[PDB]
Amino acid sequence: MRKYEVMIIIDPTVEERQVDSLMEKYLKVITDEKGTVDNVDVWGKRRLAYDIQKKSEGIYVVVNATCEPATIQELDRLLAIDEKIMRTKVMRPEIH
Amino acid sequence: KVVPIKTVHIGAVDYKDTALLRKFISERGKIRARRVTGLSVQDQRKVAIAIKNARELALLPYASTAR
Amino acid sequence: MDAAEKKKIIEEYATHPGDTGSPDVQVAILTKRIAELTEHLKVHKGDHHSRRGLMLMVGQRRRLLNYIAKNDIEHYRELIARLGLRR
Amino acid sequence: KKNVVAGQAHIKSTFNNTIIAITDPSGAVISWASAGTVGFKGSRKSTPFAAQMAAEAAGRRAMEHGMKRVDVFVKGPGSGRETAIRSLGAVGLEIGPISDVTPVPHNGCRPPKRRRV
Amino acid sequence: GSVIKKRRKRMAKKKHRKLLKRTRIQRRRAGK
RNA sequence: AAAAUGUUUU
RNA sequence: GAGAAUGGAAUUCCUGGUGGAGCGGUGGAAUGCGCAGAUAUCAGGAGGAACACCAGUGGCGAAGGCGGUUCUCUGGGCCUUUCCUGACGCUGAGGAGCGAAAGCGUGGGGAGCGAACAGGCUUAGAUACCCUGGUAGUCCACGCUGUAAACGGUGGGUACUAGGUGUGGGGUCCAUUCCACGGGUUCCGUGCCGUAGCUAACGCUUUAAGUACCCCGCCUGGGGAGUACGGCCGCAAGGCUAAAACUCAAAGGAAUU
Ligand SMILES: [Mg+2]
Ligand SMILES: [Mg+2]
Ligand SMILES: [Mg+2]
Ligand SMILES: [Mg+2]
Ligand SMILES: [Mg+2]
Ligand SMILES: [Mg+2]
Ligand SMILES: [Mg+2]
Ligand SMILES: [Mg+2]
Ligand SMILES: [Mg+2]
Ligand SMILES: [Mg+2]
Ligand SMILES: [Mg+2]
Ligand SMILES: [Mg+2]
Ligand SMILES: [Mg+2]
Ligand SMILES: [Mg+2]
Ligand SMILES: [Mg+2]
Ligand SMILES: [Mg+2]
């Protein structure tokens, strides 16, 4: 049961509601096995410092979640196999 | 030498926090050297790692190019 | 080795309640670490540096067992009988 | 033929010669010149004067194609970069943000072997 | 070191290796 | 920019 | 250290737009490429490899070595006042493992680079330097090989013997803070200067090449020769072990002019 911080860059065409639905389903797959979710922050739409998949902007999400390594890897593979998220990064701050 | 460049403190690095990373990135978009940024070795390492992460994660440009 | 089973091993191989550094405890800890590293190496056969660490642990445990057997041979027999019978 | 007004310039100056390309901001090249095109050939086409001649020729042809002030991007470890800049200025059209579009690898591909002159 | 010693050993080694190259076939037919 | 060599006196 | 995913720039190739006579290359050239539209320029795509800046005067590793980021797995080091065991230490023939690069085997991959090779130049000749091409290889997986100026040309352990001055890591103390700037102090690294001392000299000098004790490897003039014969190892290349006849009266180290 470690804690991780996942930053998610979602395609800019998303306009609310379905972003929340995606967040809910991914948090569900986290929480199916004892994986508590500490915080979900939606920065919103921001201009990308460079083009990502031909897109100049993106929706930024930060998910602080305490879970198992297998669970976080499975969440990462789900985010990868998804076609609606431009990029994902999984930080594990060793101290906090 | 380098003592006249007084040691600078930053606290938490937090690659999300773009303000410090901008303060330590060069005007061209590069990472400033230690002798010009005035950071300890550990703080400089953390700043460089955070800059690289922000670059890969689109919070910072790989090179600002034209000014 | 999240310190939980490490403390468990220390307490169930200690000679007396305060014991945490006697050769028996050291050999038990080293054997558990050798087993774990053997599994890790079976997963990653290419980890030569970790294999060298494993060999260092093996030699250290061997010297500890040699000391134990030089002092008390029956105690050495009981310890190794608990710990994998020295095959 | 057609008046492009704005346009832009690309000044590729290498150790061997200099090439000037006046292009539509869409990237389509309007006119171009090089030391080889304007007279010089071989070793003597690396000189800054060759870049001067080529730059002024390209600028003139772009002028009778009807092209006003230029934004310029320069590239390459040549010697005729600045001289070509002056040349465009002398032929006469407002020069804007001189760039540094020259590429730089992040190690990337291996460079060729060191010469043993 | 005067490098002359290394050059002498270099030439001896290179000559022997050339001999091995030229007599490679005979050695494997009958010998080392 | 490449541009080699220098028998046996007494 | 191992595994997996993944980021951006650059090169090359591909497709398209634009545009037209050269491009490229050198000491100078030519081979070469290019009106069948190159070079250049913009857009889109494919692919392999290496990770600018951070980055050295630095870190880590037994050595060889190790630099995009993230996660997973894992080794060792350092410090600490208490705590535990109570000499359990050191070294280590033979043996075993690890061991840059090149090389080898099977399969994959192949952008760039590039032995061999082809051509152009230079030349008395040029089986070279330089230029244009360019295959193995470089890359990956699994093995093999086991050698390097694998060098600090300095085996490991320990104790002692002026200092001065940078720097990396962990503590702890102080004043203003109630951060940190600062100074100290302590333990472990890593450089430079330098005393005693040592050395043929150069130089080394608390990281010894000083003063000592323990264990291992090794040397006994230069060639012949790390060669032959034999044996072992290897798929091969070769590696390891290792002479003698004969021959010379020098070979060599540092330094001086
Ligand atoms: Mg691998
Ligand atoms: Mg550098
Ligand atoms: Mg150094
Ligand atoms: Mg006691
Ligand atoms: Mg061996
Ligand atoms: Mg290799
Ligand atoms: Mg191969
Ligand atoms: Mg093959
Ligand atoms: Mg060549
Ligand atoms: Mg070496
Ligand atoms: Mg040696
Ligand atoms: Mg030894
Ligand atoms: Mg010693
Ligand atoms: Mg020291
Ligand atoms: Mg000596
Ligand atoms: Mg031999």
Author numbering:
A (entry chain F): 1 to 96
B (entry chain R): 9 to 75
C (entry chain O): 1 to 87
D (entry chain K): 19 to 135
E (entry chain X): 2 to 33
Article sentences:
Apart from the canonical binding site at the mRNA decoding center, the second binding site for sarecycline exists at the nascent peptide exit tunnel, reminiscent of the macrolides class of antibiotics. Unlike the ribosome of the Gram-negative bacterium Escherichia coli, Cutibacterium acnes ribosome has two additional proteins, bS22 and bL37, which are also present in the ribosomes of Mycobacterium smegmatis and Mycobacterium tuberculosis.
Compared to E. coli, bS16 from C. acnes has 65 amino acid long C-terminal extension, which binds to uS4. Moreover, bS16 in our structure interacts with the A454 of h17 of the 16S rRNA. Thus, we hypothesize that the mechanism regulating the clearance/unplugging of the mRNA entrance, as used by C. acnes or hijacked by the virus in human cells, is conserved. The N-terminal C. acnes-specific extension of uS17 provides additional connectivity to the network of aforementioned proteins and the 16S rRNA regions. In C. acnes, the N terminus of uS17 interacts with the major groove of h9, unlike in the M. smegmatis ribosome, where it binds between h7 and h9. The short 33 amino acid long protein, annotated as AURKAIP1/COX24 domain-containing protein, was the best hit and we successfully modeled its amino acid sequence into the corresponding EM density. The N-terminal part of bS22 interacts with h44 and h45 of the 16S rRNA at the neck of the 30S subunit, which serves as a rotation point of the head domain during translation initiation and elongation.
